[PDB]
Amino acid sequence: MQIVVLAKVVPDYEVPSADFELVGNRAHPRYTRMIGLYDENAVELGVQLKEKLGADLTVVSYGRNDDVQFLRKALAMGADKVVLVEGDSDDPYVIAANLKDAIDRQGTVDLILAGRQSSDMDRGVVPGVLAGMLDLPFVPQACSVESVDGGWKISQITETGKRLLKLSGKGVLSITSVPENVPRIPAVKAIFAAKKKPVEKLPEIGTGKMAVSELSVSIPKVESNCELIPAEDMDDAVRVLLRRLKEERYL
Amino acid sequence: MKTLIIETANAKILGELVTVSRLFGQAPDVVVLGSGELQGSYGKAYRLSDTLGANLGSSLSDLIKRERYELILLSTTAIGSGLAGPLAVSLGAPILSEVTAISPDLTIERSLYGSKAVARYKLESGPLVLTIKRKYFEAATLEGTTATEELPVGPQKITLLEEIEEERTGIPLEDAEVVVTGGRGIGSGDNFSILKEIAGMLNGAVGASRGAVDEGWMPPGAQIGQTGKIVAPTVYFAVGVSGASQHLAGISNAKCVIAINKDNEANIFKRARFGIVGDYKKAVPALINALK
Ligand SMILES: Cc1cc2nc3c(=O)[nH]c(=O)nc-3n(C[C@H](O)[C@H](O)[C@H](O)COP(=O)(O)OP(=O)(O)OC[C@H]3O[C@@H](n4cnc5c(N)ncnc54)[C@H](O)[C@@H]3O)c2cc1C
Numbered sequence: 001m002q003i004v005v006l007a008k009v010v011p012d013y014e015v016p017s018a019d020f021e022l023v024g025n026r027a028h029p030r031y032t033r034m035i036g037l038y039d040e041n042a043v044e045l046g047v048q049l050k051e052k053l054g055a056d057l058t059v060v061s062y063g064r065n066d067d068v069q070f071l072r073k074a075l076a077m078g079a080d081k082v083v084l085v086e087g088d089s090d091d092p093y094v095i096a097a098n099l100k101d102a103i104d105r106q107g108t109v110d111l112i113l114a115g116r117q118s119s120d121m122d123r124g125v126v127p128g129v130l131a132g133m134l135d136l137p138f139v140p141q142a143c144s145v146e147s148v149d150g151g152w153k154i155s156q157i158t159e160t161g162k163r164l165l166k167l168s169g170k171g172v173l174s175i176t177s178v179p180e181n182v183p184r185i186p187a188v189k190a191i192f193a194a195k196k197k198p199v200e201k202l203p204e205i206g207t208g209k210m211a212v213s214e215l216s217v218s219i220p221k222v223e224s225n226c227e228l229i230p231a232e233d234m235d236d237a238v239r240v241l242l243r244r245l246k247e248e249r250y251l
Numbered sequence: 252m253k254t255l256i257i258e259t260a261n262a263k264i265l266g267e268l269v270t271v272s273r274l275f276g277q278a279p280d281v282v283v284l285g286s287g288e289l290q291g292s293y294g295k296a297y298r299l300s301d302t303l304g305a306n307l308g309s310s311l312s313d314l315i316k317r318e319r320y321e322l323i324l325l326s327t328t329a330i331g332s333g334l335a336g337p338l339a340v341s342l343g344a345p346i347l348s349e350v351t352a353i354s355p356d357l358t359i360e361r362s363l364y365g366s367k368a369v370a371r372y373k374l375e376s377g378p379l380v381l382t383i384k385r386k387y388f389e390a391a392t393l394e395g396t397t398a399t400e401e402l403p404v405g406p407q408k409i410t411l412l413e414e415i416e417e418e419r420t421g422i423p424l425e426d427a428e429v430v431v432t433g434g435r436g437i438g439s440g441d442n443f444s445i446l447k448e449i450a451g452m453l454n455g456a457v458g459a460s461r462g463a464v465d466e467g468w469m470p471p472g473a474q475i476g477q478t479g480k481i482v483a484p485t486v487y488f489a490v491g492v493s494g495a496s497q498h499l500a501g502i503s504n505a506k507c508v509i510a511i512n513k514d515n516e517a518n519i520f521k522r523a524r525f526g527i528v529g530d531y532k533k534a535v536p537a538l539i540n541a542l543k
């Protein structure tokens with residue numbers, strides 16, 4: 001049994017606007033790179049499934065050769081191998097088609113996991129596009145997954161609560177965050193050992209892109225000129241705050 | 252251009268999609284997913300009994316092809332997102348998701364880099380699938396009703412076993428005029444008690460950052476931000492919240508953001524109107540006392 005998790009390395013997703021700059025409509029190269037946050041939730045879920053089921057866990061990525069060092073974090077968390085297709089497209093159809101080609105080279109795959117959305121493109125498109133190309137059911141915003149007879153019992157986070165679903169057969173699930181899939185922190189020695197675990201590299205395939213043009217990308221300033229209330233004396237500080245809220249007709 | 256809205260019967264969400272449709276043409280059609288009267292007056296309306304995209308088979312896509320729809324509008328909701336990607340692929344359509352603005356000349360805007368950046372796009376060749384971010388477009392008033400033609404659903408791949416609403420307390424987050432949000436800085440689930448207290452006193456609601464939700468201190472539906480709820484209260488207390496951009500994305504229209512944070516360098520102070528640099532365990536009890 002084989003679970004695939006789609007993981008994408010991205011520029012540091014905690015850099016504030018104050019410190020954030022673009023080169024050529026993308027993040028300046030100086031920022032620390034890392035697996036995206038929902039991607040790590042998906043890896044964690046995959047490792048939990050591996051632990052419960054005895055499954056193989058294969059991490060598949062489309063991106064830069066030098067992001068292998070970051071993808072190896074997934075190996076240290078418990079994944080068995082990384083498959084990286086080398087390429088630089090942001091286009092969801094190009095990405096998905098290349099992920100599909102990599103997946104088609106892994107024999108039988110029983111389930112595919114992905115993050116709810118990537119930590120740089122903010123879009124939640126690639127997993128659904130890939131599900132379409134694979135002709136498999138897509139389930140967005142899953143937070144838990146259990147193997148059962150015939151398929152998978154899946155809890156999904158909705159806008160008002162949750163849905164309990166049963167998927168028959170294979171599928172593509174995108175994963176949202178809950179306490180139960182906060183990613184584990186691998187030991188220093190596990191990281192070192194993961195340097196030896198398998199990484200397979202594949203060349204990018206020829207495939208079509210979307211007929212959309214990206215006109216511009218900009219970074220809005222974030223500066224409210226906050227009124228800081230002296231708080232050496234907290235009773236005075238809240239007295240001042242309530243007066244100011246009154247004066248400004250907020251409270 | 253020939254436009255199809257695909258959504259549940261929910262008037263708030265349908266209304267947002269109608270607003271968007273009006274930028275592109277005068278007479279959208281609608282496919283309703285699931286039950287409920289369809290409000291508004293449309294040229295043609297359809298209904299599918301199932302809300303899960305995986306269960307629709309190819310009838311819907313084949314319809315869209317036959318009828319030569321040029322624009323397909325869905326919401327950025329679990330139901331919209333379950334359908335949008337796969338449907339675009341079946342149409343060979345480009346897709347742009349989480350759309351936050353559309354200019355009069357049809358330049359389409361969306362966020363990048365954790366809502367730090369705004370990207371602008373032009374369609375070169377459609378059909379086009381869009382998913383529209385909730386609470387970014389005004390909801391059109393929907394007047395009258397429209398009967399629906401039943402469409403066939405496909406093989407059942409996913410069964411809906413149970414739908415479970417998050418237990419509700421007090422006024423909804425997205426309706427509240429005062430929101431009190433706790434983050435990682437609160438330190439425990441019990442420590443949220445004083446935030447619940449002050450929220451109750453102000454006829455407000457309690458929110459959370461992803462940090463507090465990941466710790467289990469608040470339920471997932473309390474999360475505010477890019478991938479949670481969007482709120483525009485008069486007053487927003489951000490307590491023990493660093494102010495990551497993805498959090499800030501949920502409060503762009505909050506009128507008065509009040510930061511209470513022990514770290515004077517925290518990013519939240521670049522969004523806040525008022526700020527208290529200090530321990531919330533001192534600030535909030537003091538505020539409660541002053542209010543009493
Ligand atoms: C794709 C993606 C989507 C995301 N979407 C969201 C989203 O929708 N919503 C969201 O919230 N996050 C989101 N995040 C995460 C976001 O980037 C941050 O990780 C998160 O918001 C930080 O949570 P926090 O500020 O509560 O915790 P931290 O960043 O750890 O901040 C804790 C703060 O508490 C303060 N503090 C500690 N003790 C005290 C005390 N006694 N008194 C006062 N202050 C104290 C500290 O100074 C600190 O500033 C997303 C991330 C990604 C990658």
Ligand SMILES: Nc1ncnc2c1ncn2[C@@H]1O[C@H](COP(=O)(O)O)[C@@H](O)[C@H]1O
Nearest residue numbers: 006007062114115117118123124125126
């Ligand atoms: N280049 C990629 N390599 C591997 N996985 C990806 C890639 N792009 C997107 N994904 C997966 O799809 C999810 C959603 O990405 P997106 O549609 O860009 O928001 C990510 O969290 C990953 O799990």
